[PDB]
């Protein structure tokens, strides 16, 4: 009972300190920057071959190779330039919710409702793709696998916790706890030393991969957070929730900078991605179309559209040349 | 596709696509059903021809040249709103209710109410199974059907009591284009597969009728 009072006063101290740092909103300082106009993006490629809903997609580090997981139980690696299928990996469980690509192109980790993160080796001497390691230890559905190196991966689950794994040994090196709801997404910072995870408790909190410490927590959303992605400089991140609102939080100021809500938007955000410059905030919505937000003025700088069903995944190449979108209509479209 | 190496890469892609289409053909002869219900309600012992295969449990019994795949979602112990949309394309929903449990009956009704009126399952027909007729028949004589349902007013006979429970479950439908196929089952019933088969065939006709434009 006494500690409960201590908990409350600590929140008041944080809120007062957080409010005292606020001097001017982001939309008030950059009011003199000229708008970026209309970003009209045209479909350049249409990747077909999936026979079920597409739930995840990750870009290769060379901005040419893609990976996509679907309910059909197939894992396809695409040549994004010539639309050729490089690999086709049959999964054990057809219920895959996330699917990641290694930064070196050697491995692919891709898992889901089976509570297991399966890692596949592409550069094998036998010419086929084999299941190198199956990571187990999560009691809930898996989401947002992210490779750190060729032998280190961070995973998120519905156990209200995320885990840091060692692919060689197979043991859970570090476990990050503190969420009070299913964790739906995570993103790795460019300096590969920090990451943020968005959970169902309407809170995203910054975690340290080396120490396993919740350095900071961020609030403001009214519903569960569905997606997250860092600003390109690794000093801010953007979240997407079922509240049909996008928000930009700053790690140094510990306060949200601006909101990306529009009166015509009803359905929540599914995916969040940034451009190479950090100016266009692309977000996928449940009303079958993606919107491009000017991340500095909260102005809709065009709409992608085109898809027939809910857009479930977004992806921007490392060089920023193209944007890949996946939806439940079993089609991947590449925009530019 | 100009270079010699790129010509073989295109040949590899076309060979991959052939197997992708072939696997899709073999994935159209199976019926995907969803198992739901409270614990200890017989949701794992409906058909004695199991041929099963913590998390998701599959069951792939076959009947009359048709493949039935049953997905048991129990044991996840997570928020259903985040992964129940994966089963948006299931043919039907199989719900199991235990008539001898007077305490979990209200818990079962909450489960049925949430699932039936879910936004993803607004058109998926439900095959509702009422289990353990004999256990319920003996239980009602010892304790009347009034502690669980204080609003009951009809005769204390088995026929009226069992039908009264059925009416409550169908009172939660509240939607068109959805039909609830009920059936009373016991422990020593072998024709559960036959009951599922005729309901699934009946559900397919309704969806085909809407697609053809007749209705």
């Amino acid at each position, epitope marked *: 009972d006494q500690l409960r009072q201590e908990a409350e006063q600590l929140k008041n101290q944080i809120r007062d300190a957080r409010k005292a740092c606020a001097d001017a909103t982001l939309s008030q300082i950059t009011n003199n920057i000229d708008p970026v106009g209309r970003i009209q993006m045209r479909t350049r490629r249409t990747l077909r071959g999936h026979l079920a809903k597409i739930y995840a997609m990750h870009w290769g580090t060379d901005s040419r190779l893609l990976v996509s997981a679907s309910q059909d139980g197939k894992l396809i690696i695409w040549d994004s330039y010539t639309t050729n299928k490089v690999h086709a990996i049959p999964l054990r469980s057809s219920w895959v919710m996330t699917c990641a690509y290694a930064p070196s192109g050697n491995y692919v980790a891709c898992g889901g409702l089976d509570n297991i993160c399966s890692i596949y080796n592409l550069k094998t001497r036998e*010419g086929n793709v084999r299941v190198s390691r199956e990571l187990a230890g999560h009691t809930g559905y898996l989401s947002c696998c992210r490779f750190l190196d060729d032998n280190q991966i961070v995973t998120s689950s519905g156990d209200t916790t995320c885990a840091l794994w060692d692919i060689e040994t197979g043991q859970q090196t570090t476990t990050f706890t503190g969420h009070t709801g299913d964790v739906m997404s995570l993103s790795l910072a460019p300096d590969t030393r920090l990451f943020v995870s968005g959970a169902c408790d309407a809170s995203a909190k910054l975690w340290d991969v080396r120490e396993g410490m919740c350095r900071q927590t961020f609030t403001g959303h009214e519903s569960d957070i569905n997606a997250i992605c860092f600003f390109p400089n690794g000093n801010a991140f953007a979240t997407g929730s079922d509240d049909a609102t996008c928000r930009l939080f700053d790690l140094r100021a510990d306060q949200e900078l601006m909101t990306y809500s529009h009166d015509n938007i009803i359905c929540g955000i599914t995916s969040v991605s940034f451009s190479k410059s950090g100016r266009l905030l692309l977000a996928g919505y449940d009303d079958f179309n993606c919107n491009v937000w000017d991340a500095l003025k909260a102005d809709r700088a065009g709409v992608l559209a085109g898809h027939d069903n809910r857009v479930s995944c977004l992806g921007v190449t490392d060089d920023g040349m193209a944007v890949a979108t996946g939806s439940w209509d079993s089609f991947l479209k590449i925009w530019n | 596709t*100009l*270079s*010699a190496e790129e010509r073989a890469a295109l040949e590899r892609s076309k060979a991959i696509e052939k197997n992708l289409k072939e696997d899709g053909i073999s994935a159209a002869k199976d019926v995907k059903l969803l198992l739901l219900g409270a614990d200890n309600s017989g949701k794992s012992t409906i058909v004695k021809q199991m041929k099963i295969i913590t998390g998701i449990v599959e069951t792939h019994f076959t009947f009359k040249n048709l493949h039935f795949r049953l997905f048991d979602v129990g044991g996840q112990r997570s928020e259903r709103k985040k992964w129940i949309h994966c089963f948006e394309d299931v043919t039907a929903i199989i719900f199991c209710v235990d008539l001898s449990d007077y305490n979990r009956m209200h818990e079962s009704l909450m489960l049925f109410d949430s699932i039936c009126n879910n936004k993803f399952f607004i058109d998926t027909s439900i095959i509702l199974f009422l289990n353990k007729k004999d256990l319920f028949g003996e239980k009602i004589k010892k304790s009347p059907l009034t502690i669980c349902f204080p609003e009951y007013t009809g005769p204390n006979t088995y026929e009226d009591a069992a039908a009264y429970i059925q009416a409550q479950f169908e009172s939660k439908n509240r939607s068109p284009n959805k039909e609830i196929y009920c059936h009373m089952t016991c422990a020593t019933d072998t024709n559960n597969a036959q009951v599922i088969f005729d309901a699934v065939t009946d559900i397919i006709i309704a969806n085909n009728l809407r697609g053809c434009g007749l209705y």
Partner: single-chain antibody
Amino acid sequence: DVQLVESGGGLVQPGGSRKLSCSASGFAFSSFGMHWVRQAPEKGLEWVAYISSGSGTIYYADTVKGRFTISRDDPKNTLFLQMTSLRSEDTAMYYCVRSIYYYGSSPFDFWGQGTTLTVSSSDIVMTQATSSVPVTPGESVSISCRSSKSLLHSNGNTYLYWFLQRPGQSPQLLIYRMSNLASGVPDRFSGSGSGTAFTLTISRLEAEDVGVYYCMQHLEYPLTFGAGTKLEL
């Protein structure tokens, strides 16, 4: 362990027919394209025929076009080469090579052990400057060969392959496009080039690097090898 073994060699009379079998054990044979390469006595390597994965696309060399035939038995993991009429030119050590083609693949990594066949009594021309180069260990060696056309495709890839045939062994792939090191080769090897002139450099040469070096083009069929540069110590 990847292993290709060939059998069916021997002494045959002119005008007869022989069949060579290449049984594979250690890799997914059904996904690889298999070539036949023959090496005449102390003359050099020469491409013969190629069958694609799934027996879709088949090619033959102009020398033995319409005379040889290639067949593929995927369930048995065996590759055949039936020769109808044999002259005195057919005598050579026939090798069996696997090849897989996709974005970023290595289509000439593994060569078979080779079988010896003895018989009793337009195209891209690649030329190697020299035939014998004496050198001592620790000294960098540069090997260069030219070509008729420009192997640099419009896609940005240059199709040049460098092989090393140690004495008494089978050729081993070192560089497969212009500078892409093969799997398991030492990092001291490096390659470069510009369109029609290419160079292979070996820094900090070791005693086991001696042998005959061949440069081959894969821009267009038929495949043509170089004259062959021999390193002496």
